Amino acid sequence: HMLKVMTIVGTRPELIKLCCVISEFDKHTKHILVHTGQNYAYELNQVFFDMGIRKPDYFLEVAADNTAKSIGLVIEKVDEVLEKEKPDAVLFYGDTNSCLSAIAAKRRKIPIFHMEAGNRCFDQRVPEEINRKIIDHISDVNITLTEHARRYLIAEGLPAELTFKSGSHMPEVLDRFMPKILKSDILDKLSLTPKQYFLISSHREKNNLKELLNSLQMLIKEYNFLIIFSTHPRTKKRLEDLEGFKELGDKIRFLPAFSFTDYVKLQMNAFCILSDSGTITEEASILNLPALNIREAHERPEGMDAGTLIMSGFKAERVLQAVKTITEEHDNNKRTQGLVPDYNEAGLVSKKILRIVLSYVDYINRTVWFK
Amino acid sequence: HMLKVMTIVGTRPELIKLCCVISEFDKHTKHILVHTGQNYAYELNQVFFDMGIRKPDYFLEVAADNTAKSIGLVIEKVDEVLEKEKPDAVLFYGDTNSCLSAIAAKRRKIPIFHMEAGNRCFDQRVPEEINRKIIDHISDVNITLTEHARRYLIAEGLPAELTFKSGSHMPEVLDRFMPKILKSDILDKLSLTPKQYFLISSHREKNNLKELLNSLQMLIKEYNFLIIFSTHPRTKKRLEDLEGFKELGDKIRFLPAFSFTDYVKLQMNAFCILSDSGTITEEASILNLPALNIREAHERPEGMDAGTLIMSGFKAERVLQAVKTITEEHDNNKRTQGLVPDYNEAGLVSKKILRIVLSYVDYINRTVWFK
Amino acid sequence: HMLKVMTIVGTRPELIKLCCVISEFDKHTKHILVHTGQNYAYELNQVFFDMGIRKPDYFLEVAADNTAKSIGLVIEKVDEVLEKEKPDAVLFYGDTNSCLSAIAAKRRKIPIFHMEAGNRCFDQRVPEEINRKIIDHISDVNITLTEHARRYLIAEGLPAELTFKSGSHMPEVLDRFMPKILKSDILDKLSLTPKQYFLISSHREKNNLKELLNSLQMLIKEYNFLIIFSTHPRTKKRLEDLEGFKELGDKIRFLPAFSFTDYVKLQMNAFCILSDSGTITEEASILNLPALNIREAHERPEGMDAGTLIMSGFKAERVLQAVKTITEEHDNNKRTQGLVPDYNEAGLVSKKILRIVLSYVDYINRTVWFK
Amino acid sequence: HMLKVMTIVGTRPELIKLCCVISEFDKHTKHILVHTGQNYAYELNQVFFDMGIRKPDYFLEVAADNTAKSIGLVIEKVDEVLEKEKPDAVLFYGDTNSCLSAIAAKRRKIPIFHMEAGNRCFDQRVPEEINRKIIDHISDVNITLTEHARRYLIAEGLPAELTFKSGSHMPEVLDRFMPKILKSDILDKLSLTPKQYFLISSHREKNNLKELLNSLQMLIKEYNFLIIFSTHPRTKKRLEDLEGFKELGDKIRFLPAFSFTDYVKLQMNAFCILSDSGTITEEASILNLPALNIREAHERPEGMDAGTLIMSGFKAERVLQAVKTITEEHDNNKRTQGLVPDYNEAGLVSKKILRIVLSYVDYINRTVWFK
Amino acid sequence: HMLKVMTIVGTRPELIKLCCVISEFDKHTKHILVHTGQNYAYELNQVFFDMGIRKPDYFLEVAADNTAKSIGLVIEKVDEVLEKEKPDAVLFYGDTNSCLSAIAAKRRKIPIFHMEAGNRCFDQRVPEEINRKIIDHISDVNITLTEHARRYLIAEGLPAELTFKSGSHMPEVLDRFMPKILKSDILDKLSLTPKQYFLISSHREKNNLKELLNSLQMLIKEYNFLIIFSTHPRTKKRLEDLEGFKELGDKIRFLPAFSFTDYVKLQMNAFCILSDSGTITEEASILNLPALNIREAHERPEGMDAGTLIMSGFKAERVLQAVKTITEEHDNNKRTQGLVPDYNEAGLVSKKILRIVLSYVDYINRTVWFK
């Protein structure tokens, strides 16, 4: 007789950060993988993800509109599948809207285990901050990437004995895919010279776009390297409609969606990366990448203890100073700073999460629910 | 030019605890009162509430099913009215499901003010505990009845400078309606003798019903007073289907829904009250009532500092000991214990909430949202 | 069927501070009163205590030697009576050695309720500090005289929801005995003039005795009032063997043990009191007494918020300055400072403790012991 | 002139965890080793311990009955030896009943240093929880195995500046004895095949025994490996009197007491270990053992950060799932998870404790006792 | 366009601990180095410091008198240079009087970054404790050598998100100068035999001098090794005027000021070091030195976790016991204890500080100053 575990996701970054966790749970539990979104969208993106991540057991068909209605629908639709499957435990990674379905799991007294817990940037303009607080304060067990995040949780009155530190999921994920990553021909497909392009990645939600474009312009004047720009369609157009977009010409190139493995190869060969991805601190630490976090607040203070990157924002003056500082003596193949102990020591996170789940389902059922 | 304030409710106890707040906001703001539930249900209950509480501006028609679907619908439906009205601030009282719509208000960067904040019973089997954490941790300003609740909030890392103590809303509400309460003829309508009946009130969510019935039986054997039982239809039937329900006979009487004012008159003349109402500690303190809280956990520790009541649970042995202890020397007209300073000193809460709202909308917009 | 409650004491100050608690528990529970000490000693002191405090059900005959052996004997002897009587709950007041028997009650999973909890002077030379920490950290419920003490307990990680504030026991005790106190003829028996004697009380555990004697000498030179000195035999002799003890002559008089009621009358008529009693802050606040605490650390910071007394120590320079400051404009019958809200508002503590016990035996048995 | 240090123990696990500490203190202080128990019992167990641990200077002859009387006797008897020897400091390891004698050391103002401090499982049914709180809150200096335990102590208001982290004592102890451990012929003496037996160890304090037996039965059906069962005589008999004990037959074998070194060899060659020993997390981490903690709460959360073991409880369903998960790919000689930094980095704990003692005796005497 | 950064120092130990930070900031910012003291004094000491530390841009000519007047002058004089240069950020290391000029920087809303933050010895007799609290509580960003210091800051209510851990500056500094250090001929210049001299260093602020001299005497009797004594002129004379100073004769030698590099060579070859330098714990850990901290309180608790040194004080009895314990088996070339992870893992601190500064100037200007 197996434990039934249900993992609930709604996005590709969740699936990537969970892929080893998913494998481990598939070996040792009756593991139900639930995607809150649309099967059609997932099959249209599956070429790009084709990593050996097996298909989810359910697609709940909630359009990820990021609306109050879509939030209500995730709660209602996840509830139906909880009623049907009656899992012994539920898993959530991070703080996308789909984590709000923890409300339904809690009302049913299903033990909840939350990974990448205790993210705090202390800027409530970041939309994920609403979800963060909610998911951390309703989960029975929280599992953090760092001591910083564990302390943040304890500081908000959460029980230390049910807060664990797994470390980053990314060392195990990267190690799994590194042979494929190294064999990627992405540089040949895009005709790129290693260390002679910028990789810019911006996927977050007017005055600010102009600032970004001016930063891009200034980087071209300064270094005369191509800029590879990875962003959402809505944002590509907005940029294109801007006055002096035509000045960039050959020095800017928008990247279509890429496979994870091609994309890491690209990262590993950039002159410098400018990213608003919530994964940049981990990626830059682990792979010794030259990197700017172009956000104005962030939730990975552990990087700053290590010297991992610079949080530049997206305006030209600080961006230029940051790029000079990072790139002047950087060799990805020589580690001089940026190693984060809580990432570096994470190891087989997949095994850790399963062992936590097995060790605490009964504990939670007794001490929380008095069953 | 007025501030536009939107107050969101879904139940009659919210409306009662807010009735003075509503009046004060009606005088001095553009005040929009939103009820998440069904207009039909509200008009069927309006005879019983007919207190001078003006009608809500909106009925959102979400059936209070207490389901995951109804929670999703409150979030979606409140969002529509936020989009339409664009209030400058939103108010929530307590922690019914309707408070979960604060999620929609937060996503829109509308300042949120929460009354009766920082309720904690530390038993997560109480369904309201899910809502409590959520509403307290997303609100920009929390307003508590007590120092105990203020400390609970600060202990969960919430900002002390945006946590206030109003005191109980009930002294102002009771004072408003006391002339009507005193003139109630409820004792004549039910042919009751003052101090010669039990008033039992149980409105919360099998083995336990039998225990309760045995408690009721034991109280009849011990005191031979009539029992007036106020409960939900679902629960009346369940009780009636029980074996030795027929033994109670003339000594038990189910009460139909009553007006607030009749009901307080009844409270004020009972030999002893047994209640699971979240308001019993306040009512019993303020009106010097002989009372048992029949729950197994509660969120009004301030009562225990004062000697207000006994939390007996619903089983006969502790119930009997508690009733003897409370009633043996109790005179409602002689105060010997049970006065709670944070209730007793609350005064005109209505005025306090408006002054807080006016004093902090701009502060929140600057310090939280950087507007 | 009654709850069986066992109250464990070893000293007269415990019995005095509990006398109303004892009465209330006698009315409503099967109340077993256990004295850890010697029946012979208790009957030799019973003239002086003859307050209507009924006799303890057990005398365990442990000599209060204040030795490691006597501590071991209290633990062993209390255990025997726990085995025999099997109480449903145990009560301890304060932090005498007898509270160390809570160890035996805990090992038997008997709910423990502790009054006058969270005393802290932050000077570990005070012997009671060992006992304080032990009793506060093993009790299931702590009951404090003040908010200060409640905060101290919460600050040491103890559960806020099982920490209550009763207020001082002394307003209820004094009110019970005030008619007898006012009718005392103690001033006539000792031929004293109201406001024309010092009352000095020192009952705690060489260089320091000389300092005290010099203080006494200096007070005689300054005011020429008689000194009434209440202390232990061991200490009377030590003083008498001192060089210039003969200089005091007629201006010092050692008091034999007195009845509580005579002793409060004496307090109420002193020019000024110098005391190391742990009750002086309460007594001086409640009865508006002119007072010095002659200790070097103390555990009643609430007094300092109110202006109750001065902690002078026992050396002449600070003692003299303190006496002038206190007595210059003091009238016991005119309140100008020194009223402590947490004392003043305590009311019928007896009723509070019983209501707490009834409300939390089951809670403790579930949440602590999982019974 | 040497510092006189007195180390107080009552059990074999204390002596084992202290054996290097004892050696280091013997070199550099006047070191008095006190055993609270019976010399006769110690000599009957000395064959099995014959590790080069020199004999204690005192046997106080308190029978380890685990009674309230034996606790009182440890306090009284340790006091006599404190009076006689007048040590400058006292050492305690862990939280056996003998640590309660710290009460006597404190009353004498002897600096107290406590190792393996800040153990918390948050289940007060575990008897050691009474002792834990007492010893941690009376010790002048606490020394922890982990950051988790240091944080638990700070969270209970204890002084951070007098709380240190030594790490686990076990790496140094194991390293000392590893040559003997590796040369053990225990497998030959018991005719065992490496990786083809379960080692079960249960030495803690009816319905639950039956559950355990069913777990044992299920493991035999599943794996058909011999079970080596190490337990107390009281428990061997209880098991034997059970109905279907006869079904196990040849597949269960009770182990007589063993030498430490033989026992670690056995651990290192088991297919899987099921243990309630408080040392299993350390042993399993350090030696890369396949292990279940069969308790229902535990005090080594650091293991869960690392992936060391599973806390299965003792019931068959969770036990079986846990055993499959642990053993499926486990090779003791290939480290894939379970390494705990605070254990792994501990090094020569013995040297650390002596350096702490020398560095803080004067500090404690000044800041605690004002000497 | 560069960021303008102003680093403010007043002493040689600041310059040494900053020398790599200074180089890194010189490469990547407009870096203004301000020395609050006298140019004349600096040029008289420059032979001894002649490390490739470029000359400060300003000497403010405040005599380091350690007076209330000199403190006022540092504040006034630093203000003038802030007005003139208008830096975008200011840097302070440690807690010398010159850090008090942070008051002027704060009043001008200049972001302040503080290194070696959160030093606490909990003995307010240490003069630096005044400065510590002031500088930590006014700085916008604090940067600590350890987790211990980070926790101390968080415990005083400071923002965790603006507190970072760089680790010790000393591994990078030592690594920079190790080739020169190893080539030093200091042993030949002083005719010393490796491991056959004591190095004593005492530079902090009568009864105590005599105690120290007796310690020195006792060490000569015990080991018959030469004592090299490094101290201030004021202190050399005081010692010399002491009675039995003449007994030491050939076995004591006062060292003139030395170059940093010669001095580390000397450290690395001493039999044992006795030091009150605030750097001894770092030096002794990193270089595996035999060492006593001769102070009575200290601020490097991380050492005690590792077994780095003994805090002996300066009196003979504890000093002798400490020296025996440290030196008996010590080989600088064999690491057996004393390695501190937060020091050992520090790496290129210089790079960390610059990355923090670039990452937080805008954050501070928004969230602190609302610019």
From TrEMBL, chains A, B, C, D, E:
The UniProt entry, under Pfam families, shows: Epimerase_2 (PF02350)
Q: Pinpoint the UDP-N-acetylglucosamine 2-epimerase domain residues.
A: 27-356
Coiled coil (residue ranges): 200-222
According to the UniProt record, what class of enzyme is this? isomerase
GO molecular-function terms, A-Z: UDP-N-acetylglucosamine 2-epimerase activity
Q: Please give the organism.
A: Rickettsia bellii (strain RML369-C)
- Keyword presence, Methyltransferase: no
Protein name stated in the entry: UDP-N-acetylglucosamine 2-epimerase
**Record-listed E.C. numbers:** 5.1.3.14
What CDD domains is this protein classified in? GTB_UDP-GlcNAc_2-Epimerase
Q: What is the lineage of its organism?
A: Bacteria, Pseudomonadati, Pseudomonadota, Alphaproteobacteria, Rickettsiales
Name the PANTHER family for this protein. Answer: UDP-N-ACETYLGLUCOSAMINE 2-EPIMERASE
Family membership: Belongs to the UDP-N-acetylglucosamine 2-epimerase family.
What keywords appear on the UniProt entry? Coiled coil, Isomerase
Q: Which domain of life is it from?
A: Bacteria
